[PDB]
């Protein structure tokens, strides 16, 4: 019975809330009371990557921490050697409406998606040396908002049809599907062991998914509006989310509840991108106010501001070695920061 | 290592010349987002201009390139992907004029949300009321009764500058200009001069349509130029 199911669901939600309240014996602010503040984090722009025409909608760092792919809605994926700022590849896209890009962990491939609802995989190491669509993954019924490689043959994607999908690139078929979000999945992040991944959606909630089984292990609530970005804390047992309610929030997977919140009265614009530093002590969040804040992840105090973008900061990335940050923006420039 | 640096710089230059050519092509074409409901006659407009998660129609008027995007196979929750179209020259809007107990109210709310959205507040809109023949048929038959779906029709009088079409009944003119004035009441409120609207009374099979957008797009370009000189 639908009414019986609704009553049972309400009782289960109340039980979950009571369990979370019981587990919250201490606050993170009280726990981190003995940790000295990090002070002011004065980062400066070291490289400015020019060449994109339209607003840059995504970027992703390479595992070498030197090359990085950037997608602009002029119909271009540009691969930068961020050290020398020389472009390595300039891949024209079949559809100019790209909303996400990914760089393969081995560096052999890049991926992109967008309003065409199709994930295109580009091989950077072809026999001729040019870049051609190695694989065209079709089957999503909504725009592709994020995609992340697991390896050279499997890629996890998040679409505007409220579902995520794990694709086998060799055959082109969907290996796995993840359903349960009621709003569009706006970002996903793979765990360090890539056995789980968290997806934040336009339902003001994040969900932890088991890639092997396809089930949603946990659902994290607490944000008030659309979640635009999400990323694991480096240990793999916590993560952070940025939302349209203009507040960042760090949750943990083992207490199944919010750990702590990064918000300020002067900030009314939502967060479009989040990313941790290598140790996780700093949470870097890009905002609609063209700035990017650096939060003390344990004290919630804002330790820095990455001002310098002329338009909305649409994408962030911290290198695997933690040397540099890179922020793309709607003004069509990537800036590297130290 | 200097050999690798030279090879990388040669690759960068070969990329940069192609980027120069692609920038020349990109700046020489105008991107039009075509937005409208299913029965709004939008597909008929696309068919006229011509004769997947998005459909791209390239056409050329007076040796000028236009790129019009009919966004199909998407969900009705547009608040996220619509942000992609903040850099288009114009959002062509197709409204089912003679049309959910109140469809035109939903169209008005969609136009209002587009107008007040912070990323689309700089992008201009071309407005097409694509049900003029059907509007004439409905209002002449006496089945309109618009004064209960929109009570403002009980006191609205035709503005003095609103020239009716030749041979056109006063009721048809009053209804069509009432719809136009509702869209203008939305648009003129908090417009702030950063973006503009071009209400056009269109039929589904008008050949003038490809011209209208032209004469709108051109105007938009000019205004943007006049915005750069602080003249507007």
């Amino acid at each position, epitope marked *: 019975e639908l009414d019986q199911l609704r009553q049972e669901a309400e009782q289960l939600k109340n039980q979950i809330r009571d369990a979370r309240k019981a587990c919250a014996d201490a606050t993170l602010s009280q726990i981190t009371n003995n940790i000295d503040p990090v002070g002011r984090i004065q980062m400066r722009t070291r490289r400015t990557l020019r060449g994109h025409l339209a607003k840059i909608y995504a970027m992703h760092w390479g595992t070498d921490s030197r090359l990085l792919v950037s997608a602009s809605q002029d119909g271009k994926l540009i691969i930068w050697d961020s050290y020398t700022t020389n472009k390595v590849h300039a891949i024209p896209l079949r559809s100019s409406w790209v909303m996400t890009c990914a760089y393969a962990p081995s560096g052999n491939y890049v991926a992109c998606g967008g309003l065409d609802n199709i994930c295109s995989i580009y091989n950077l190491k072809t026999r001729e040396g040019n870049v051609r669509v190695s694989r065209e993954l079709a089957g999503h019924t909504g725009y592709l908002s994020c995609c992340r490689f697991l390896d050279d043959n499997q890629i996890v994607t998040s679409s505007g049809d409220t579902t995520c999908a794990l694709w086998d690139i060799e055959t082109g078929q969907q290996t796995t599907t993840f359903t349960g979000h009621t709003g569009d999945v706006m970002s996903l992040s793979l765990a360090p062991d890539t056995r789980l991944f968290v997806s934040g959606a336009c339902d003001a909630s994040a969900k932890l998914w088991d890639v092997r089984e396809g089930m949603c292990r946990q659902t994290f609530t607490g944000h008030e509006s659309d979640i635009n970005a999400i990323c694991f804390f480096p240990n793999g047992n916590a993560f952070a989310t940025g939302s349209d309610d203009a507040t960042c929030r760090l949750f943990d997977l083992r207490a199944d509840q919010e750990l702590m919140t990064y918000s300020h009265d002067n900030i009314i614009c939502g967060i479009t991108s989040v990313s941790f530093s290598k140790s996780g002590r700093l949470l870097l969040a890009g905002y609609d106010d063209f700035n990017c804040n650096v939060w003390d992840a344990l004290k919630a105090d804002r330790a820095g501001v990455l001002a310098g973008h002329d338009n909305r900061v649409s994408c962030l990335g911290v290198t695997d070695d933690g040397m540099a940050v890179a922020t793309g923006s709607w003004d069509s420039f990537l800036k590297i920061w130290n | 290592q200097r050999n690798e640096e030279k090879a990388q710089r040669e690759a960068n230059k070969k990329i940069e010349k192609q980027l120069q050519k692609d920038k020349q092509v990109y700046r020489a074409t105008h991107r039009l987002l075509l937005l409208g409901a299913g029965e709004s006659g939008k597909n008929t407009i696309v068919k006229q201009m011509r004769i997947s998660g998005i459909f791209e129609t390239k056409f050329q008027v007076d040796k000028v390139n236009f790129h019009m995007f009919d966004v199909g196979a998407q969900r009705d*929750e547009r608040r996220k992907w619509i942000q992609c179209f903040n850099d288009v020259t114009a959002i062509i809007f197709v409204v089912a004029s003679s049309s959910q*107990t109140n469809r035109l109210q939903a169209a008005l709310k969609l136009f209002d949300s587009i107008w007040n959205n912070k990323w689309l507040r700089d992008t201009s809109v071309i407005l097409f009321l694509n049900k003029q023949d059907l509007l004439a048929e409905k209002v002449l038959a006496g089945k309109s009764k618009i004064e209960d779906y929109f009570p403002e029709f009980a006191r609205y009088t035709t503005p003095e500058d609103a020239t009716p079409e030749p041979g056109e009944d006063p009721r048809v003119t009053r209804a069509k200009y009432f719809i136009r004035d509702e869209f203008l009441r939305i648009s003129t409120a908090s417009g702030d001069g950063r973006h503009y609207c071009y209400p056009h009374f269109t039929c589904a099979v008008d050949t003038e349509n490809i011209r209208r957008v032209f004469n709108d797009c051109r105007d938009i370009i000019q205004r943007m130029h006049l915005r750069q000189y602080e003249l507007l």
Partner: nanobody
Amino acid sequence: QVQLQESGGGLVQPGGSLRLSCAASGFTFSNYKMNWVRQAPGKGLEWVSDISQSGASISYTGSVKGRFTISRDNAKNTLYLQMNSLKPEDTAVYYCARCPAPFTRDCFDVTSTTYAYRGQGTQVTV
């Protein structure tokens, strides 16, 4: 979790008055705009009314002007629709909807079939 629980909908004689109430939880009520939408039997979602953050700016759909009145109570985090001069065509499921972002003027998607921040709704039969 964003929760919008409505109450007060029920059978009423034509020409009657009925007070739909909406209790909101899981978000800051004063920061977001609010909207009442309705779904008639066999019809799609229809926008009825909205009220801004401060409560000063009020709008209604044409078919309900002068009859229904929206209000918000920020100290109690609730939304009201006072219906008067009810008609048989007013029979519908009424959903208390929310704008997708705070301090923001655009209220996009409040009438979507699978909208997220929308209440379960209460049925009003006239």
